[PDB]
Amino acid sequence: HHHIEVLLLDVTPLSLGIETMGGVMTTLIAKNTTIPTKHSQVFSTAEDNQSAVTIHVLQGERKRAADNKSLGQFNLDGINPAPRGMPQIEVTFDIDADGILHVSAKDKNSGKEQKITIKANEDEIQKMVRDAEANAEADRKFEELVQTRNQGDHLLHSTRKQVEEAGDKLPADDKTAIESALTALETALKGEDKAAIEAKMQELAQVSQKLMEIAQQQ
Amino acid sequence: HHHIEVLLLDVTPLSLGIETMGGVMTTLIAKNTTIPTKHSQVFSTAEDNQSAVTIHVLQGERKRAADNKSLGQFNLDGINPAPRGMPQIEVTFDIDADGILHVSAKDKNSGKEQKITIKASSGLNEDEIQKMVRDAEANAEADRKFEELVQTRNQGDHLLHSTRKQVEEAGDKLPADDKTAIESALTALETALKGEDKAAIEAKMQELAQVSQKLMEIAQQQHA
Numbered sequence: 205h206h207h208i209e210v211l212l213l214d215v216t217p218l219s220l221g222i223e224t225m226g227g228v229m230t231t232l233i234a235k236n237t238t239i240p241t242k243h244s245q246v247f248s249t250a251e252d253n254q255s256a257v258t259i260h261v262l263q264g265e266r267k268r269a270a271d272n273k274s275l276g277q278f279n280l281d282g283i284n285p286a287p288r289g290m291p292q293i294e295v296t297f298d299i300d301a302d303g304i305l306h307v308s309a310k311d312k313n314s315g316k317e318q319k320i321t322i323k324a325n326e327d328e329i330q331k332m333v334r335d336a337e338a339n340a341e342a343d344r345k346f347e348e349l350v351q352t353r354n355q356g357d358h359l360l361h362s363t364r365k366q367v368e369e370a371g372d373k374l375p376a377d378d379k380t381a382i383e384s385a386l387t388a389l390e391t392a393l394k395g396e397d398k399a400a401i402e403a404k405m406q407e408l409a410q411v412s413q414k415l416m417e418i419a420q421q422q
Numbered sequence: 423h424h425h426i427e428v429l430l431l432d433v434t435p436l437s438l439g440i441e442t443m444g445g446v447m448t449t450l451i452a453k454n455t456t457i458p459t460k461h462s463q464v465f466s467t468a469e470d471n472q473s474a475v476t477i478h479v480l481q482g483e484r485k486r487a488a489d490n491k492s493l494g495q496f497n498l499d500g501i502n503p504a505p506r507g508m509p510q511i512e513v514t515f516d517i518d519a520d521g522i523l524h525v526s527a528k529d530k531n532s533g534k535e536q537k538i539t540i541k542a543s544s545g546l547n548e549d550e551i552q553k554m555v556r557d558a559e560a561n562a563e564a565d566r567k568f569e570e571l572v573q574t575r576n577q578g579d580h581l582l583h584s585t586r587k588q589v590e591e592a593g594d595k596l597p598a599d600d601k602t603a604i605e606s607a608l609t610a611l612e613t614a615l616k617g618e619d620k621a622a623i624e625a626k627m628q629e630l631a632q633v634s635q636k637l638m639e640i641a642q643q644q645h646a
């Protein structure tokens with residue numbers, strides 16, 4: 205008989221994750237995930253030629269990083285120069301039967317690896333859960349906003365880089381409309397309105413058609 | 423000394439897991455998990471001295487394994503003899519940036535390892551994805567009931583086998599009335615396991631506990 209059975213030794217009381225760009229908690233191990241378990245996800249740099257990243261370990265159901273429990277922090281340095289998004293940093297959360305959490309960060313290109321060990325009531329747990337359930341909508345809105353923001357900032361930077369290396373190819377009126385749309389996006393990014401930013405991204409995208417060809421023709 | 427960001431925004435459309443004992447889907451990677459990601463969990467054999475396990479890979483939200491889509495299957499052979507629950511088999515689901523799912527299984531005692539690669543589009547299409555979601559919300563209560571029933575059944579099966587082993591395990595320092603009453607409770611439990619009622623089975627487990635004091639004592643002395 206070829207059957208396999210689930211070992212259930214324990215469950216996690218709260219979500220476990222790391223802080224990512226925009227000050228948001230990104231979950232590696234969700235609440236009520238069976239223990240022992242090993243989850244890992246791949247992340248990247250937020251800047252061109254960024255040489256190091258900070259892993260800030262968080263516990264809780266809130267979306268804003270400061271609104272959760274801070275478990276620990278460590279750095280991964282020696283990341284080889286590359287555009288943002290290029291380096292691949294694998295972050296692993298490993299929970300054993302002892303309930304002891306191990307967090308590691310590993311660069312796949314350079315092989316460099318760093319890690320920490322994190323040790324460790326019901327009233328505080330339930331307070332965190334209730335507090336999360338009370339603010340749930342604001343938290344969701346914040347999360348979506350952050351994602352939209354990072355996307356927009358990316359769009360802004362990339363479009364400006366291609367505009368600078370475009371000339372003198374890129375024509376007059378196109379460059380004017382593009383720069384105006386870029387300014388518009390930049391102002392939208394400071395706001396709390398997700399829809400306005402989506403709108404500005406779309407607007408910048410619709411005056412940007414020629415840029416693609418120009419960069420492609422070399 | 424700067425910010426770290428999510429590499430891809432892509433997420434898994436449906437849960438990914440394997441079939442476990444009782445024909446139930448156990449999820450390794452939940453629906454809407456960001457990619458690339460790697461999840462691993464430890465499982466074991468369901469029978470004594472079992473030499474192999476079948477890893478049956480499933481995609482979907484249903485609790486009955488067959489109600490989900492089968493992605494692929496492979497066997498992990500060469501498992502050294504041991505009681506059920508003893509071998510430690512680590513199953514890993516790894517989705518890369520390309521969205522390709524790699525499933526591996528490794529027995530820790532024997533070091534044996536087997537794996538398969540599952541391509542995208544060997545899963546459900548967008549329409550099928552939405553259909554699966556609807557079907558799961560429609561059947562959620564029944565699926566949950568089936569799942570709980572399966573867990574209860576497996577606990578009961580364990581108790582049955584273990585108690586019968588204790589009788590087998592010496593096991594006749596056990597007197598007249600006791601062996602009979604225990605075997606009767608075991609038969610009652612075993613027939614209850616055939617039923618669809620979780621509470622009835624739990625009841626038979628407790629009742630079996632009420633006839634087992636002498637077994638407990640004898641075994642306690644023999645081990646100690």
Ligand SMILES: [Ca+2]
Nearest residue numbers: 207208442443
């Ligand atoms: Ca099975």
Ligand SMILES: [Ca+2]
Nearest residue numbers: 232243244459
């Ligand atoms: Ca994960």
Ligand SMILES: [Ca+2]
Nearest residue numbers: 224225425426
């Ligand atoms: Ca950060």
